[PDB]
Amino acid sequence: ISEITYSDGTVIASIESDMLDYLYFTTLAEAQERMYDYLAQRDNVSAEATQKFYRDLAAKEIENGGYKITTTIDQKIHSAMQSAVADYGYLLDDGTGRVEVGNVLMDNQTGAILGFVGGRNYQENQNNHAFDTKRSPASTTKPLLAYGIAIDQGLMGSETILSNYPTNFANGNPIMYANSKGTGMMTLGEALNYSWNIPAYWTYRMLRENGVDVKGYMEKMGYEIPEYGIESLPMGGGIEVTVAQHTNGYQTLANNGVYHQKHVISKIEAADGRVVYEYQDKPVQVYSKATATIMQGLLREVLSSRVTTTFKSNLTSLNPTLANADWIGKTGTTNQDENMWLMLSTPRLTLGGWIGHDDNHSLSQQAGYSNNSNYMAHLVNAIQQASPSIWGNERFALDPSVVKSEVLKSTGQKPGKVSVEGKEVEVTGSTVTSYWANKSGAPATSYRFAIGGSDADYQNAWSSIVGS
Amino acid sequence: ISEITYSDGTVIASIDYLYFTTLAEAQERMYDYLAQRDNVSAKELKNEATQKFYRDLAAKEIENGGYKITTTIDQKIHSAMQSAVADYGYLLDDGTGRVEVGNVLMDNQTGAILGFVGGRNYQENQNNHAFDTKRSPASTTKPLLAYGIAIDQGLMGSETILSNYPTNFANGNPIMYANSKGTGMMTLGEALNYSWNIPAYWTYRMLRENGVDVKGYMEKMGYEIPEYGIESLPMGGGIEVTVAQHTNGYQTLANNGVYHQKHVISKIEAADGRVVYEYQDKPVQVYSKATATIMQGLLREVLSSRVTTTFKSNLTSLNPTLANADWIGKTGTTNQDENMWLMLSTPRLTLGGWIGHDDNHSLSQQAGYSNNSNYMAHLVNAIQQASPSIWGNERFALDPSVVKSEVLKSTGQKPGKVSVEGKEVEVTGSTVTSYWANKSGAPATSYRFAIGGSDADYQNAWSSIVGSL
Numbered sequence: 001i002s003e004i005t006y007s008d009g010t011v012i013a014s015i016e017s018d019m020l021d022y023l024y025f026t027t028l029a030e031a032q033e034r035m036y037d038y039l040a041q042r043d044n045v046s047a048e049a050t051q052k053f054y055r056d057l058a059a060k061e062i063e064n065g066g067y068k069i070t071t072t073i074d075q076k077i078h079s080a081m082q083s084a085v086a087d088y089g090y091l092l093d094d095g096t097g098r099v100e101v102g103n104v105l106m107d108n109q110t111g112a113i114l115g116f117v118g119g120r121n122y123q124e125n126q127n128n129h130a131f132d133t134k135r136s137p138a139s140t141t142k143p144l145l146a147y148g149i150a151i152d153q154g155l156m157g158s159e160t161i162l163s164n165y166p167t168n169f170a171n172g173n174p175i176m177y178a179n180s181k182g183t184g185m186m187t188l189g190e191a192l193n194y195s196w197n198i199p200a201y202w203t204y205r206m207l208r209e210n211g212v213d214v215k216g217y218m219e220k221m222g223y224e225i226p227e228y229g230i231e232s233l234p235m236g237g238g239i240e241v242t243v244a245q246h247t248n249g250y251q252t253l254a255n256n257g258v259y260h261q262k263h264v265i266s267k268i269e270a271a272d273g274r275v276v277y278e279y280q281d282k283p284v285q286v287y288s289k290a291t292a293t294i295m296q297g298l299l300r301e302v303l304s305s306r307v308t309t310t311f312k313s314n315l316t317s318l319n320p321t322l323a324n325a326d327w328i329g330k331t332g333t334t335n336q337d338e339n340m341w342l343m344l345s346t347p348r349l350t351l352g353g354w355i356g357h358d359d360n361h362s363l364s365q366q367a368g369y370s371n372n373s374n375y376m377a378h379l380v381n382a383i384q385q386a387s388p389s390i391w392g393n394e395r396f397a398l399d400p401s402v403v404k405s406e407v408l409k410s411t412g413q414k415p416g417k418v419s420v421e422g423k424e425v426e427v428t429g430s431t432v433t434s435y436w437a438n439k440s441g442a443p444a445t446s447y448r449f450a451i452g453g454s455d456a457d458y459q460n461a462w463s464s465i466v467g468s
Numbered sequence: 469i470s471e472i473t474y475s476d477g478t479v480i481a482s483i484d485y486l487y488f489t490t491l492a493e494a495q496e497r498m499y500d501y502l503a504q505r506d507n508v509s510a511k512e513l514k515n516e517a518t519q520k521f522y523r524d525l526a527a528k529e530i531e532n533g534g535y536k537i538t539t540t541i542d543q544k545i546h547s548a549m550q551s552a553v554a555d556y557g558y559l560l561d562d563g564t565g566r567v568e569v570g571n572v573l574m575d576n577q578t579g580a581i582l583g584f585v586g587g588r589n590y591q592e593n594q595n596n597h598a599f600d601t602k603r604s605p606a607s608t609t610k611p612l613l614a615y616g617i618a619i620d621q622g623l624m625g626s627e628t629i630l631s632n633y634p635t636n637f638a639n640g641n642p643i644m645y646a647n648s649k650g651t652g653m654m655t656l657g658e659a660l661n662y663s664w665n666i667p668a669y670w671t672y673r674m675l676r677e678n679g680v681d682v683k684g685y686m687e688k689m690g691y692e693i694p695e696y697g698i699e700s701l702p703m704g705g706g707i708e709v710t711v712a713q714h715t716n717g718y719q720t721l722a723n724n725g726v727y728h729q730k731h732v733i734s735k736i737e738a739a740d741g742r743v744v745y746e747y748q749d750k751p752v753q754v755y756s757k758a759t760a761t762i763m764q765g766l767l768r769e770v771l772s773s774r775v776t777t778t779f780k781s782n783l784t785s786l787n788p789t790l791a792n793a794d795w796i797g798k799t800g801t802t803n804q805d806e807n808m809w810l811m812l813s814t815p816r817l818t819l820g821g822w823i824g825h826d827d828n829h830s831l832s833q834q835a836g837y838s839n840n841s842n843y844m845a846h847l848v849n850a851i852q853q854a855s856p857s858i859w860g861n862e863r864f865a866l867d868p869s870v871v872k873s874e875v876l877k878s879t880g881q882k883p884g885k886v887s888v889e890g891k892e893v894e895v896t897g898s899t900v901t902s903y904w905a906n907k908s909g910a911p912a913t914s915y916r917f918a919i920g921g922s923d924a925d926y927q928n929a930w931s932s933i934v935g936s937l
């Protein structure tokens with residue numbers, strides 16, 4: 001007689017007990033953590049690896065008591081998501097075995113989880129790849145941990161230049177991206193669309209050199225990272241996250257920089273009217289509104305450029321109308337292709353997606369670029385068939401507090417006079433608008449104008465520029 | 469008493485696009501027959517009064533005689549194609565007005581035309597964009613007139629290097645691609661996938677420099693080009709073609725270099741069963757089998773690299789199995805975006821496609837990249853549902869006659885001893901197999917290893933080669 005229900009109150013199951021489906025265990029486990037804090041607090045503790053007596057009590061309270069447990073799960077969307085993974089799951093198998101999958105669909109204004117995919121098939125495997133397994137987010141780390149923070153601290157703007165010239169780790173090893181040692185200077189947009197690694201590495205070093213509390217940012221979105229003094233951290237080195245938590249970081253970018261904590265339980269009510277737990281809205285401005293809406297604009301291009309994912313193309317062919325909603329996203333690829341991530345938002349929703357194997361062995365080279373992008377387009381279509389207005393028709397837009405600068409294409413700073421080789425120069429050339437999240441906008445071009453680069457790099461780029 | 473039929477004898481009509489197109493070709497064939505019958509001949513044929521008299525006689529024969537006309541059209545494929553453009557034609561519209569379209573499906577072993585799309589909707593607009601419209605094929609011309617010819621003449625192979633360093637036309641204007649003046653050296657594979665312009669320009673110039681008979685190659689495919697002395701010829705300048713004729717040129721690459729002449733008419737038969745006209749197969753080896761099969765491997769990557777078309781992604785979402793056929797293809801885009809082209813083949817079929825506006829105004833930037841790719845993936849899929857074996861599952865494959873070479877990745881040539889600004893150098897580094905269509909494969913590396921390039925260009929490039937040993 002204790003009960004778990006969908007957001008509209010329809011029963012999911014009753015809870016009982018015995019001695020010897022993803023939806024059931026996920027929602028029960030979150031309901032038990034809610035019951036525990038409630039119990040711990042009503043007996044005024046804060047003491048203790050028992051504990052652990054409170055876990056057991058919370059399970060008993062729910063399996064004996066008569067409690068109504070309201071979830072955020074939308075029955076139609078969640079069922080459509082199961083049918084999707086059942087009908088199009090095979091799209092992910094790439095010749096490397098049975099490829100597993102995790103997907104969380106989150107509401108950007110509230111943090112509520114509308115539906116999810118726990119895996120390919122509960123009966124054949126029960127690991128919950130939406131809420132339990134933790135893998136490096138790799139590249140999908142770079143907007144949250146490196147570029148979004150640098151934009152937020154007034155250290156760069158949308159058309160800032162970064163170095164992708166070859167450079168080494170402190171140990172001598174060259175920093176790589178697939179087989180490439182590096183190219184030269186590029187925009188942010190290019191560093192993002194292609195997902196290069198050297199530009200994120202220099203951004204994070206800048207942040208450290210300037211004393212940015214990067215930990216403060218990540219903690220406010222609930223990320224737990226044990227060691228920040230890692231050179232590859234912007235590449236996802238030393239980080240490991242569930243699909244649900246990571247979706248929650250993209251929710252933050254999509255919601256104009258304002259976090260709401262992910263949840264699957266909204267209310268726990270006793271048969272006697274005692275409300276044991278109700279979700280409190282607790283919004284947190286993590287990035288300014290200028291930062292987040294600037295970041296949205298870049299992530300729009302990461303998908304429309306198709307450089308690292310075929311998603312827009314796949315979705316165009318399945319549902320050209322849905323494909324013209326305002327989609328933004330980032331992909332991620334682990335160093336041996338062990339894990340592929342694709343994160344998508346419209347202004348209303350965020351959908352996180354991971355694929356990999358349980359034993360961590362390698363996927364094919366294109367599992368992320370192609371298989372996962374195509375499977376996710378199917379899943380996005382399904383959610384839509386079930387709830388045709390849930391993705392929303394609104395567009396992401398720059399906040400009015402965003403600051404505009406006219407800069408040069410070649411330096412991403414204002415045109416101006418710099419001294420090169422001792423001998424002076426007047427720099428000019430084709431220009432562009434770059435967006436900033438400070439008061440003053442972009443600076444005037446100085447000698448070292450980009451994020452990173454050795455002296456030899458700057459001498460090579462400066463030279464080619466004065467090729468005017 | 470006169471009738472037109474599908475290839476299976478089923479009756480088309482008594483003698484919409486389908487009707488006029490096939491009537492018109494039959495009339496063409498009848499004219500030819502009347503003219504030879506009355507032994508008219510030659511300069512007399514150029515007179516327009518007599519031209520008029522014979523057209524009028526051809527037409528009247530067809531309504532008067534009781535001629536049985538059998539066409540190459542597969543009824544089921546053709547209607548699927550008609551349904552497809554009715555259902556999916558809207559995918560092409562892009563905010564530049566209503567976009568027209570032409571498609572021709574051709575059997576690669578016979579040159580027969582199985583079906584076609586004349587336009588968005590005959591009742592609204594009656595111009596036939598498969599058979600009558602002529603527009604520059606743009607990029608789409610590079611594989612045929614630049615790179616395929618050069619490979620066939622022994623002047624390059626699959627990983628030959630070509631210059632895409634900025635350069636100017638003879639009048640001093642720079643050769644552009646989008647808004648880029650160009651980059652540096654690059655392989656043929658990358659020149660083809662991204663569709664750069666400067667490499668095609670140097671290839672053609674080289675063929676002029678070796679006196680290659682390019683006109684001879686184009687004429688064997690039935691191409692009519694009034695003037696070959698044009699610097700932008702291999703980009704498609706000074707060429708305008710119908711969809712049907714251009715399909716025929718990609719038919720030739722697809723059929724291992726051997727052309728068959730396009731046609732929707734296979735036979736016309738007099739009331740009493742004698743043959744006024746019947747199609748006579750005349751295959752011509754236009755490219756060596758080594759050339760065309762090397763081209764096939766290159767055009768495979770144009771599609772699967774997805775740089776200029778999203779086609780393989782679209783097809784993959786509509787039909788994962790059909791996407792695993794062995795597709796090869798090339799896109800093209802006019803200056804200013806007035807015409808887009810996507811040409812596709814499996815070993816059995818070629819499908820040509822054009823989109824654009826009847827008064828030539830610009831399409832949007834992505835109209836070829838995304839729209840026409842998506843629309844063509846739907847058309848391809850409708851063909852499959854209507855005739856499930858038709859595309860086939862065979863693979864293109866290098867002909868035994870192809871020579872392989874191990875060349876330096878960075879020169880496109882055999883590793884070796886090279887003289888650089890005085891000091892001789894030993895040139896080494898990673899290698900790769902390059903395919904050639906001559907007797908001896910690839911030569912040894914020499915100072916001008918690439919197609920095209922200035923001295924300043926070469927002093928840049930060697931800088932890198934050397935600084936990397």
Ligand SMILES: *C(=O)[C@@H](C)NC(=O)c1ccccc1
Nearest residue numbers: 138139195331332333368369
């Ligand atoms: C981050 O992990 C980087 C290296 N890039 C990608 O997300 C990616 C994904 C798929 C194909 C190419 C690159």
Ligand SMILES: [Cl-]
Nearest residue numbers: 771772773780
């Ligand atoms: Cl492919």
Ligand SMILES: [Cl-]
Nearest residue numbers: 310313778781
């Ligand atoms: Cl694509």
